[PDB]
């Protein structure tokens, strides 16, 4: 399967009470596995899945050093950008960063990325070629110049194409139990009729991993249906995910609708009629 | 967590 690791950074400024809150978190596929919080007592980079506690103290020191440094650049940036956006010292602004690796089924490098947002809006992000930069506006343009000068792309490419991928493989190899697991969904249907002519059908799918899924309502015949509800996939809390797609039909013809389901942990795609 | 390529803005 295709596999990805990612890091997300966030720094909110708290003018007049403390230094910027800073929160880093790391993921492999849809699984969180490290974190840092500027406000947590430990002041280290802490583990968040079994297979990472395996790593020795040399690691944790390392990742801490790394993460703290991010923290600082974000602390400066918050300052710079006030200047650039001509904003006052009062009130709080967010800066966010995110980068990572993808790899294909062969576990070979597929694509890299690294982006940066300010107050919730894109600021500067690295193109797919790992060489060029898109920038929002005349502030971003200032940075793009600064970063072109210092070959930040060249340095990043190194990491993204090199070490970031190497570690993803290392993790995918230690993680087998958890990361290459592929839990199929436990599904049921539910018949809630709005009285008389109405009738709606909810096609539940619980306890799956990873979150990528596709459930789609059909008539007997042609497939698509645009007049259907579905909720964003949601975290169970125990490591798996949940989703359902409702649709509305008459209180005749209940059993002529079939809900097809497509997940990576299902060999053949499921399908489901009405039970009774 | 990257080791290089992380500069200010």
């Amino acid at each position: 399967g295709s596999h990805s690791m990612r890091y997300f950074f966030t720094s909110v400024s708290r003018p007049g009470r403390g230094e910027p809150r800073f929160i880093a978190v790391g993921y492999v596929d849809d699984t969180q596995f490290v974190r840092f919080d500027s406000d947590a007592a430990s002041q280290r980079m802490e583990p968040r899945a079994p297979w990472i506690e395996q790593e020795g103290p040399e690691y944790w020191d390392g990742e801490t050093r790394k993460v703290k440094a991010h923290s600082q650049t974000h602390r400066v940036d918050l300052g710079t950008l006030r200047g650039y956006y001509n904003q006052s010292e009062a009130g709080s602004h967010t800066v966010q960063r995110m980068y990572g690796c993808d790899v294909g089924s062969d576990w070979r490098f597929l694509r890299g990325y690294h982006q940066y947002a300010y107050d919730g809006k894109d600021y500067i992000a690295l193109k797919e070629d790992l060489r060029s930069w898109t920038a929002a506006d005349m502030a971003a343009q200032t940075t793009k110049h600064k970063w072109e000068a210092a070959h930040v792309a060249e340095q990043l490419r190194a990491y993204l194409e090199g070490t970031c991928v190497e570690w993803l493989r290392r993790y995918l190899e230690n993680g087998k139990e958890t990361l290459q697991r592929t839990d199929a969904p436990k599904t049921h249907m539910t018949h809630h009729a709005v009285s008389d002519h109405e009738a709606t059908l909810r096609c539940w799918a619980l306890s799956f991993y990873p979150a990528e899924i596709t459930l789609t309502w059909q008539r007997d015949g042609e497939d698509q249906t645009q007049d259907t509800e579905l909720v964003e996939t949601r975290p169970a809390g125990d490591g798996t995910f949940q989703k359902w797609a409702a649709v509305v039909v008459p209180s005749g013809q209940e059993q002529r609708y079939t809900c097809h389901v497509q997940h990576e942990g299902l060999p053949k795609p499921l399908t489901l009629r009405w039970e009774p | 967590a990257a080791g290089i390529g992380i500069l200010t803005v």
Partner: T-cell receptor
Amino acid sequence: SQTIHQWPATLVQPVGSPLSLECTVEGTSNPNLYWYRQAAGRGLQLLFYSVGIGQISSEVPQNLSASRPQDRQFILSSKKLLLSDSGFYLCAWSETGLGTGELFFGEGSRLTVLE
Amino acid sequence: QEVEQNSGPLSVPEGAIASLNCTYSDRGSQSFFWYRQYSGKSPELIMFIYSNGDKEDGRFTAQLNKASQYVSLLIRDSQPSDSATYLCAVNVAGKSTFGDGTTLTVKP
């Protein structure tokens, strides 16, 4: 050295003496700062490093103390020196963040401790 | 042992090619450096390098091979003034760790 100046250049001090070496930097800001040491055999060893003002970090369990009252003022010091503490001490700075790793060095404080 | 570097004096004749070599354990090593250190002086950067291949600056040529985990430095057409200790440094996890250095003597 235009960018980072360090002193005193050279110290002969008896055991149990106090130590204080000072390090200044000019021409960047919010720099990473470093105290390294070149003990009996020419390899640099990291003693302290700092991400920014008032933040210190020790690498080896140490007799020495280090501190940073200011963005660009870096102080290494000791209450009572030992023979062990003889060495060449090098202040260094790098670009705020995690750039290429390039290190710029002071001119060095050379410390001999005597019995 | 984290970063290995033959010490003892290598001697090369003036105008030959000097070659220094460095080795490193930790695979997740991001960037690599040669500094040069003159007797009684602070050390000073010749070169850095952070992806496989060769990088040349004048008489100096760095070589890195992440697969084999080594960084070389060659000095073309060596002068007497190139006699120095050459420290190798490997930046992992936001800290450059240093070799014990190799000492070169260019015999005129």
